[PDB]
Design a protein around this ligand. Structure first.
Ligand SMILES: CCCCCCCCO[C@@H]1O[C@H](CO)[C@@H](O)[C@H](O)[C@H]1O
Length: 123
């Protein structure tokens, strides 16, 4: 008899501790800041490479787009891959083919970008 109401204790809803909730939002904050810092590094280092190589301004979108697609594939390798290092070199090959074949981009300039983007995403 007294047992009937005791079941209601099991699944009863209640308040969420503020400190635990703040922990959730602080990790999200950390997420977009780390994202932005990584993005600014990749962008700024690519820009330096392009300046150094006296790349035409019409080709900036091509090289920037390359650096970004490479950085994204490298992030995926770091996470999903049991051997990120092997998949990175394969991503390099894949994207360098794509961007020189389709967009006429210079592979020695793409190699420079690669060497900048890798430590940014891996470290
Ligand atoms: C391990 C998680 C179990 C903790 C459940 C109790 C948390 C709810 O507890 C309540 O949280 C409110 C918001 O912080 C405060 O206003 C109350 O003083 C606090 O007792």
């Amino acid at each position: 008899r007294y047992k009937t109401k005791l079941y209601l204790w099991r699944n009863l809803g209640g308040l969420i501790p503020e400190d635990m909730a703040i922990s959730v939002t602080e990790s999200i904050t950390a997420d977009w800041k780390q994202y932005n810092d990584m993005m600014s590094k990749v962008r700024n280092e690519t820009l330096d490479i392009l300046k150094t190589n006296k790349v035409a301004t019409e080709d900036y979108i091509g090289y920037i787009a390359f650096a970004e697609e490479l950085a994204h594939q490298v992030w995926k390798n770091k996470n999903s891959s049991p051997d990120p290092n092997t998949a990175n070199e394969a991503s390099k090959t894949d994207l360098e083919s794509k961007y020189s074949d389709v967009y006429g981009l210079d592979v020695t300039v793409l190699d420079a970008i690669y060497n900048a983007v890798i430590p940014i995403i891996m470290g």
